[PDB]
Amino acid sequence: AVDTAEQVYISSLALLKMLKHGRAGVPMEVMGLMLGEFVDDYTVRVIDVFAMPQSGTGVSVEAVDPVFQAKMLDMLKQTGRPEMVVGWYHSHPGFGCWLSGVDINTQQSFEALSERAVAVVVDPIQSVKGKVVIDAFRLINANMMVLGHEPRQTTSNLGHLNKPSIQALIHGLNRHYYSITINYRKNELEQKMLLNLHKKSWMEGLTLQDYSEHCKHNESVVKEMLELAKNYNKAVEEEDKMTPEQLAIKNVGKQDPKRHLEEHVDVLMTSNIVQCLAAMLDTVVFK
């Protein structure tokens, strides 16, 4: 009768509702509630994520309106599907992820009212390059002071999916709460239709990018390649032959030998091949 290793099943539209609401008010700590379904002991799912109307207080238990939620939940019973909340979320743009002074209290109020109520922290100012630092957490009780926390029993995936970094284990890990693993519920009827409407172009794959700027682009690159070739000429004729293998390894440039020599040459080669082949095909097709 204890936890081992839970797994949070998030949906594709769940995280999309998380990023847009987090990006919406960035300097005002957006705050909403997480709605899912406890399917068994140690797997938990969430498909539908709604937001909450915020207040002057901010992320707290007071911004959670009870009469708005039950009015909202009742109207969701007839449209879509009725279910019970399984947690909450908030946004910490000022730092990474850890449970704040009042985040731990509203966690206690939710796991006393609901069952376990996993809290999700999303940093909207970090989800920028190609990755998101979304993490969820779960409070452990203070009664297990003589037993080691995270009662893992039959699992070896816990070394994966994140290790606790120095910016995480300073605030509350692992003595207050613990981390949890989250995977992505990918399936068909969602994934291929997202790709075919985002990264897909029908009329664009056969255009010609008319040759005012096209052959013009094949001229500014020849000059800088020539100077690199003359610089490549300068090093190859030079040929220091006193202690060569140490002089080569302590004096690297990472731009002379083959870095700036074939990079643009490859780019100019592929572009005119694509351009001429698309030019030849339309001459085969169009009369």
Partner 1 sequence: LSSVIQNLRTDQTLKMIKILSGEMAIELHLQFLIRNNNTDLMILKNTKDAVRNSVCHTATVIANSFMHCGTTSDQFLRDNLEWLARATNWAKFTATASLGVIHKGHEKEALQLMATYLPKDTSPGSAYQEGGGLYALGLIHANHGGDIIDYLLNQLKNASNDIVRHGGSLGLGLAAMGTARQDVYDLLKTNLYQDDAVTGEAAGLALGLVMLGSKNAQAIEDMVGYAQETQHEKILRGLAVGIALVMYGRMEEADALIESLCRDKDPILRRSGMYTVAMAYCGSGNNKAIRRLLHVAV
Partner 2 sequence: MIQQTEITCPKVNQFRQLYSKVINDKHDDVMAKFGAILAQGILDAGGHNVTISLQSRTGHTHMPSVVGVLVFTQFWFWFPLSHFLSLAYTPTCVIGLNKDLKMPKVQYKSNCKPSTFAYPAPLEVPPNFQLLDNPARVMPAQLKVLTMPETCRYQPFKPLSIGGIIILKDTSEDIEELVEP
156 binds, among partner 1, Zn ion, partner 2, none (CB under 5 to 8 A by kind): partner 2
Min dist. Cβ of residue 37 to partner 1 (A): 10
Report d(CA 234, CA 247) in Å as an integer: 16
Report d(CA 91, CA 124) in Å as an integer: 7
Contact 158, 5 (CB under 8 A): yes
Among 143, 153, 187, 201, binds partner 2 (CB under 8 A): 153
Residue 18 CB contacts under 8 Å (≥ 6 apart), including other chains: 49, 89, 120, 122, 134
H or E segment and range at residue 196: helix 191-198
Three state DSSP letters for 158-178: CCCCCCCCCCCCCCCECCCEE
Beta strands 177-179; 181-184: pairing state: unpaired
**Cα dihedral sign, 76-79-84-90:** negative
171 vs 217, which CB is nearer to Zn ion? 171
CB neighbour class for 275 (10 Å; exposed up to 12, middle 13-18, buried from 19): middle
Does the annotation place 198 within a ligand binding site?
no
Report the alpha-carbon angle 53-95-111, nearest 5: 55
69 vs 181, which CB is nearer to partner 2? 181
| Residues in binding contact with partner 2, number by CB under 8 A | 7
Tell me the C-alpha to C-alpha distance, in Å, between residue 276 and each of 129, 217, 239. 34, 15, 40
52 vs 228, which CB is nearer to Zn ion? 52
Q: Which stretch binds partner 1 (CB under 8 A): 78-86, 111-119, 150-158, 254-262?
A: 150-158
Does the annotation place 92 within a ligand binding site?
yes
Residue 89 CA, chain-centre distance (Å), reads: 17
Q: Which of residues 72-111 bind Zn ion (CB under 5 A)?
A: 90, 92, 100, 103
5 vs 102, which CB is nearer to partner 2? 5
27 vs 148, which CB is nearer to partner 2? 148
Binding to partner 1 by CB under 8 A, coded x per residue (else -) over 36-75, reads ---xxx-x--------------------------------
116 vs 185, which CB is nearer to partner 1? 185
User: Is there binding between residue 11 and Zn ion (CB under 5 A)?
Assistant: no
103 binds, among partner 1, partner 2, Zn ion, none (CB under 5 to 8 A by kind): Zn ion
Min dist. Cβ of residue 218 to partner 2 (A): 55
Residue 263 CA, chain-centre distance (Å), reads: 30
Min dist. Cβ of residue 151 to partner 2 (A): 13
CB neighbour class for 119 (10 Å; exposed up to 12, middle 13-18, buried from 19): buried
User: Is there binding between residue 154 and partner 2 (CB under 8 A)?
Assistant: yes
Among 78, 141, 143, 153, binds partner 1 (CB under 8 A): 153
Neighbours of 158 (CB within 10 A): 14
Among 142, 146, 189, 285, binds partner 1 (CB under 8 A): 146
Interface residue list for Zn ion (CB under 5 A): 90, 92, 100, 103
Sites of contact with partner 2 (CB under 8 A): 153-159
Annotation: binding site for Zn(2+): 90, 92, 103
